[PDB]
Amino acid sequence: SVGFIGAGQLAFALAKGFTAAGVLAAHKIMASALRKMGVKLTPHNKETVQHSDVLFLAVKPHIIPFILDEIGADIEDRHIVVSCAAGVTISSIEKKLSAFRPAPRVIRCMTNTPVVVREGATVYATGTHAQVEDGRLMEQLLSSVGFCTEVEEDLIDAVTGLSGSGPAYAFTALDALADGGVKMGLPRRLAVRLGAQALLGAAKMLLHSEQHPGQLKDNVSSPGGATIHALHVLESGGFRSLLINAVEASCIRTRELQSMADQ
Amino acid sequence: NLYFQSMSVGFIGAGQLAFALAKGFTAAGVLAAHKIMASSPDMDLATVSALRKMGVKLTPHNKETVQHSDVLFLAVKPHIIPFILDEIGADIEDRHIVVSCAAGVTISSIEKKLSAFRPAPRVIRCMTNTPVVVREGATVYATGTHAQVEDGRLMEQLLSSVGFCTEVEEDLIDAVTGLSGSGPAYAFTALDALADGGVKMGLPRRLAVRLGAQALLGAAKMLLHSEQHPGQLKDNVSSPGGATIHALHVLESGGFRSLLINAVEASCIRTRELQSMADQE
Amino acid sequence: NLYFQSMSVGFIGAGQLAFALAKGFTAAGVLAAHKIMASSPDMDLATVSALRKMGVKLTPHNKETVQHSDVLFLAVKPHIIPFILDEIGADIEDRHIVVSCAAGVTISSIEKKLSAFRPAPRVIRCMTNTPVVVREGATVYATGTHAQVEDGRLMEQLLSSVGFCTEVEEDLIDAVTGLSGSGPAYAFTALDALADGGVKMGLPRRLAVRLGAQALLGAAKMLLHSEQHPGQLKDNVSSPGGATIHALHVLESGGFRSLLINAVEASCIRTRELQSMADQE
Amino acid sequence: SVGFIGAGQLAFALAKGFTAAGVLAAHKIMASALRKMGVKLTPHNKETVQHSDVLFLAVKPHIIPFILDEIGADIEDRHIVVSCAAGVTISSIEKKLSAFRPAPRVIRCMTNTPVVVREGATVYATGTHAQVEDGRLMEQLLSSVGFCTEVEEDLIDAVTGLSGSGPAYAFTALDALADGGVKMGLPRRLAVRLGAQALLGAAKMLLHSEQHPGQLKDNVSSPGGATIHALHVLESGGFRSLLINAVEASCIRTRELQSMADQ
Amino acid sequence: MSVGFIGAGQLAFALAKGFTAAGVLAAHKIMASSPDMDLATVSALRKMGVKLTPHNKETVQHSDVLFLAVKPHIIPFILDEIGADIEDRHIVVSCAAGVTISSIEKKLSAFRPAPRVIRCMTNTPVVVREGATVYATGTHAQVEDGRLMEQLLSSVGFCTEVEEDLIDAVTGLSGSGPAYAFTALDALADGGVKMGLPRRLAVRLGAQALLGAAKMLLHSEQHPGQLKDNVSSPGGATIHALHVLESGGFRSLLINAVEASCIRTRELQSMADQ
Prior knowledge:
Distance between the termini of chain A: 33 Å
Structural class of chain A: alpha/beta
Entry title: Structure of apo human PYCR-1 crystallized in space group P21212
Number of domains of chain A: 2
CATH topology of the largest domain in chain A: Rossmann fold
Largest sheet of chain A: 8 strands, mixed
Order of helices and strands of chain A: EHEEHEHEHEEHEHHHHHH
Chains A, B, C, D, E: Pyrroline-5-carboxylate reductase 1, mitochondrial
Largest interface: A-B, 106 and 105 residues
Oligomer: part of a larger assembly
Keywords: amino-acid biosynthesis, oxidoreductase, proline biosynthesis
Organism of A, B, C, D, E: Homo sapiens
Shape of chain A: elongated
PDB class: oxidoreductase
Number of strands of chain A: 8
């Protein structure tokens, strides 16, 4: 049994991904188009906690404690509490929950919206009292909707900057690539389709290759060709540096949010 | 569905594109490796020996590839095409469909050269990309004057086995080159850079490369499976005050969007130049 | 609908905002001009004499405005608010709703000052903008500790007569200031620049000003009447190879988008500073 | 009776605008959601021309002649031919049509998509054989869906750069303003609503004022305030120059398209 | 002596207002003609005492000195309209942007030989009698014509004779100059408002600062760099501010403007000479 606290864009994404995986029946999950896929709903978080065994929390960082205060009394020995809330630290969750019952089993998750098409990127960190089997169960569950691996909690800020914010970098890139295609005479719908297919195929090539991305870049840029001409104009605008800047900005903002959680 | 489990394919050229197409086609099961022959001027390349291990037939003689083939792919550097056409023109038969992947080389230029030998050559111009090697390529094609309707149908069936494929008017192919032709190199560059940023912020390189590649693959699949605008998805995922909208602002401040427009335009314009450089000679 | 055709409104301040609100309210017919009183320290301003011609009552004495009013708008420079509250605090009655439009001045700071005199002051914080003068303003409000539910309802009815109006949590008002508070100045700047571009390309200035203002008004109305994303509308209107997508590229190359993000952020941050500068004193 | 040749985004926009104006009944217009509002449809341009008195042409520039060749024989004395096609010159239309019948009555229109909410910006130029009453009828028709005025044909390129492309500049601006609002903590939907309302209100203020936009800027920027701080950061990025660059780029591209028409 | 204006735009008004404010001409001796005269320009000119008429030929018949202050591409049309009405007594003074003495003489010479033509590059501050004007004399202008022109244009500001091939550069500098100043003053006022000044005071102080600095330079033998040195105390506010101007290439932007305006003027002279 799984539950969600928050019905944001990441709650639906995970529920859609889990049900599409066939790893969970839609009626064994309740949250606090969901009904269309057969997801029980409620406006009282206490009802989800009662229902749940593994319990997800999807809320804004500054909202989490209020759910914890409300449900803290109902956390049982059986519960694994999995927080996806951006910037909320394991420490802040355990401190709240330990006021009610000692040894809350807490896992901190950093996932992304492509779990909705089962191509997510997820990392997780295990809390003070999570047993070894809890982390293994987490990895098996989140592996059903994409890549999943364990990290130390102090890398989640960096992961956020890369694969957490990554999809938005890609949506920005795909909008611009389609603008470029339209400038050069392509219909908008075809430009969006072609750019998305190019990025998907390149990403899969890299994941299926043992080679460096620079190596694949080299392999595809013929001497004097169209592609190396285009790579030059990327380089002249500092394209690489902007993506480094982005990962860094999102990571650093996550640290500022983690500090507000730990205040 | 058209029956072609018994047709032969040839590549003039044995480089990255010929390898990627042969690998994708055989992995799709639509062609048996022994029905594929590729010819290379320098048969000491890495792509050549990998074609051998696949079971493709390799030869130094372009005429042998022609005599083997029903579908004939031209996958050589562009300024080589006029010499290849002179070399094999008299070996083109009525059965041949000639599929040019040479960037910028136009249908008219190919038909002009081949018409000197036998009238009505069946020519298709293709714009595809290396991710056909994992069957996720992006392919467009344009059909020539003497290409029968069934030739375009066969073309689309074959290239759809290794990725997206659709027919366009020839005058869009230069723009497609700037977008999905060059597209994978833009993504490889972005992925190297994203991984550098992950490493700067403390991730191991191997994990940074894996995470950034998975983010890009997932985002692209989301867009393809959504009816929605990429701006709508950007809005959907960017929580107020959060890490992502902070990172998007630093992308905007460097003109990130404009660089990708610049790239599509430059690749397209260079493709037009190569085509005009061709015809001046 | 709440009956208030018989309540009196007062403005502390008689500047641009007080004029714009009085003009919008009277043009909406929701208030008669003689039910409005405004007080100014310098009654030699242009806004003062225009208020006179409208039929608004003008006075130099802030206490007289308070004794006249049921709804009391504070529309003065921000660092003036502490002195005004000291001056009129003992004149606040149980009937008064105090509506602060002072940028950055927080509900807590106002309630602290007014609580010294009479407990439970009814305070609402407003963030509105000058286009209320043509009844197309953008207004948000936040209700204070002692504001009854009906006070927020009355507030929204009144401010909705002159534009969009909705209730927010107080901690969004700084961001609203950066966006719709300052927004009209960003548009005036853009319209001057657009007109310069029209004149450069040969249009008469008067026509350039009219065309650019109409383009902006129409585009904004389209967005408000569409469910769609502004990126979707940008895609809808940008024909392949056309004039508009060429112009969008030059906007992107200068980081146009990032400048507007920078502007919203700077106005918001300055608004936070003014609020913190307040409380340090 | 009115007809449309092309069912692009501008054909629907005009038909939606005319029907919303009550200046035309939807069934007195045919094109070559339209049926939903009661607009007769057909795939043969010759059928619209037969049906029509005033005849609009909405097609890509490089497509116009093919409609003219197809319908040229059917143009009658009664017809006013109104081209909205981007970059297609009066000269290129009259030259094609005069091969069939002398003295075609041609008007060249530069309108924009906000005609769909009856806030368009339209200019028109009258051709060699348009009578005076034709231009007056045009102005009355296009005034029902926004501002309309006559110009010389050699200003249409400039108008395109300003009010033709203008709405896209505004959609770009509104997306960025909403990104800024979201960065500073606002929900996306509220940020989009507030920014659009701010731009609409500012534009209306300017249209209802006799004052200069600089004058309204001055009137609203209080000393030391939030707004003048934000205006400074616009100025430091050359904000004004980018909008000049845009009007110029769209105008110049229109000239290049007019040259392809006149080749 | 009497003066005519073909054209009633901002520059013909400025000259007419300046000439009348100077008293060198009684306004009833001034005629202006336009096919569509601005609503406020009619009332201002009529209250000024300026005779108004829609027919360019009435202006010509009325005038001894005849200013042409119209959009450049209109000029060939004007010259063909009035060319037959030019007499020996006429001095034709062109203010039209980039219209060359050659293009005017070629047109006028078709009607009567030896048209007396002067080309003028003036600016709008003639309206407050602080204009900057240069002029070039044409092939058949007599020596006394140039003298009369300089005496007239000196009544409303600085005036000196130049070779015609410097008028493009003069356009870039003093012709366009006032607009550079108006742009500068708006920005300086934004800066004053940013730092806490009321808009009205900021506008007044910046305009007064510019006026006084320009007068200092005019009344000085000294280099502008030398005046900059005299007012910049060590470590002070002013040298700090000059540094941030330097870091943005302030000087280069003004050189760019002069050059761009000059070069645009040459493009307009080519169109006239086409």
